[PDB]
Symmetry: C3
Subunit: 243 residues, 3 copies
């Protein structure tokens, strides 16, 4: 019966917490047939760039190639209740040349250590822009952004939701205030009616205009001021004063 | 040739649909060497909290530790066309103490049963806020929100997209209407020109103001009304009436 | 010692780049005990619909059922540095009937080949709407949309962020301009003050109105124009002209 020389050699227990940036795991074999074995990571799945953040005492499957010193460790997924901080990166390469820092792959990263969840893309295959969808749990924010300045923003400590583009035009909802900003113009359109604000003008073009102030009304011009009516012009007040 | 006592014992077939909240699976061994075996879940991958939603008749790999009664079941991924409703939770623990309801982990959940896709974070390691990015397929919505009231919203039955913060400031795009609301002020800025609306004021500060009405123009003040011009003030109408 | 007839038969090397839409992989066994073997995909994990985009020379585990011609290939995850373009689809079925094009499942897809990252849902189990959260790296955009016209948009080449609903109401932030559009009305609310624009009206209802123009002020009506003040009406200018 032909069987590969590469086989499950012994069930084991991790003797140490795997260091975050390490692929080696010290494992103690616990089957009756120093005492630790330095094992190389054997992934449970493809497209996972980081080994599991194995804690001391987790059940580990130790694989061995024949009688050689090539030992491998595979997480068995039976000791999840031991996990503390976990950071996992799933990578999907996006370059014609192989080899590879996330510069040549699309990825999704859950990092408790660095306190973010991020989906990011790369510019290694003709893509014009890079993107990131990030939940930043450290500062407290959700971002949707490219690499040229366009950004959706939810920032919790400032109670801010914002639509911001690369030209500093934005719609900002921060606390009890809303701020719109645009260097060329801001225009409201409803049917045939328009209201525009631009660096030199405030323009309204509509059918009927009604400006009601329960208190005072003030309109002041540094230059000339014109009132024009195709129909009758009406003034109603207890008295009229011309300075 | 040393080999672990823990080995693939027999290929089998699931005899029942696995109940959603169960880790045990009844499996019938189908290799010639009651008839069902209660098996414990053996995961194919780490960071998966839920066993596959195995349907009756799926090919199952039955593992066994030596001659003991410890039987384990592993989905082989060769019977995907039998799947009906699936709910899968990937968890990434985010607490210094181990052990663990999603209160101590970042996670991503695809649930056909509960009709949502959700990416959520936890507040178990000093994070100031929790977050959720949810596609709610039951009610019909996409949400981006924290746990204090800041929210992006796409709600389909109401044709609503909204930016809403914890102070009830919002930019609402619902059906054929747009509503902006902010308790302190709403300000539009374009260059040196500003338009502000606040609880007691409507203020415009610009260079040139043009208000054209194809129909009627009405401005009414409960108190005083002042017209001021540094240059000539012009009135043009077929007739003028002072009440 | 009972062991399944289905076992790891030999470690091997992929002889060819797996074609994107293929489940078969030509593998050369490299254990001493034509020369290629057509193997069927054996997944490393459940809920993965696409086999890994295996490149020539990757280490492959060849499984075999007994002495039969049923050979299977499993990616070992030890040759990731050979990956070039990768497209991976994780599927989560969402239909009461089994069987299945993404029409009956929720899914998440990372595709370097087609240049997008997409989370999508289906309408096979009573869901009223389908959804997609897509990073389109080809055109350069992030979309959040349903299947009836509601859409959040980040489009990089146009420097556009937009909230757009099925009735063509939108808040558009494009380059140096902001455009709001709504067929019924656009209303700003701050406390008791309101500013509304609708197809026939421009309405302001506030306490105090101040319209300051450093240059000229023009208000023109095709019909009548009325000025009403409950208090004194004041005119201040170097001279007044009635046409
Ligand atoms: Cl290492
Ligand atoms: Cl793994
Ligand atoms: Cl080697
Ligand atoms: Cl990379
Ligand atoms: Cl501001
Ligand atoms: Cl159970
Ligand atoms: Cl599994
Ligand atoms: Cl046990
Ligand atoms: Cl938890
Ligand atoms: Cl409202
Ligand atoms: Cl095929
Ligand atoms: Cl796989
Ligand atoms: Cl078969
Ligand atoms: Cl499908
Ligand atoms: Cl427009
Ligand atoms: Na890690
Ligand atoms: Na301000
Ligand atoms: Na696996
Ligand atoms: Na489930
Ligand atoms: Na309303
Ligand atoms: Na592929
Ligand atoms: Na325009």
């Amino acid at each position: 019966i032909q069987t590969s020389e590469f086989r499950l050699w012994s069930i084991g227990r991790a003797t140490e917490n795997k260091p975050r940036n390490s692929f080696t795991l010290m494992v103690l074999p616990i089957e009756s047939a120093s005492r630790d074995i330095p094992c190389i990571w054997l992934p449970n799945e493809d497209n996972r760039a980081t080994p599991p953040d194995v804690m001391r005492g987790e059940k580990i499957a130790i694989y061995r190639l024949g009688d050689t010193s090539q030992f491998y460790w595979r997480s068995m997924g039976l000791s999840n209740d031991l996990r503390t901080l976990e950071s996992v990166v799933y990578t999907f390469n996006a370059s014609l040349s192989p080899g590879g820092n996330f510069d040549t792959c699309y990825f999704m990263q859950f990092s408790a250590h660095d306190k973010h969840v991020t989906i990011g893309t790369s510019k290694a295959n003709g893509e014009p822009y890079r993107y990131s969808v990030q939940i930043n749990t450290g500062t407290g924010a959700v971002y949707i952004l490219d690499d040229i300045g366009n950004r959706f923003e939810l920032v919790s400590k400032d109670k801010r939701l914002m639509l911001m583009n690369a030209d500093n035009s934005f719609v900002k909802v921060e606390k009890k205030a809303i701020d719109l900003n645009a260097d060329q113009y801001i225009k409201l359109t409803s049917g045939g009616s328009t209201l525009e604000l631009n660096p030199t003008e405030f323009k309204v073009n509509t059918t009927n205009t009604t400006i009601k102030s329960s208190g005072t009304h003030i309109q002041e011009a540094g230059g000339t001021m014109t009132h024009k009516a195709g129909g009758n012009m009406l003034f109603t007040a207890p008295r009229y004063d011309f300075t």
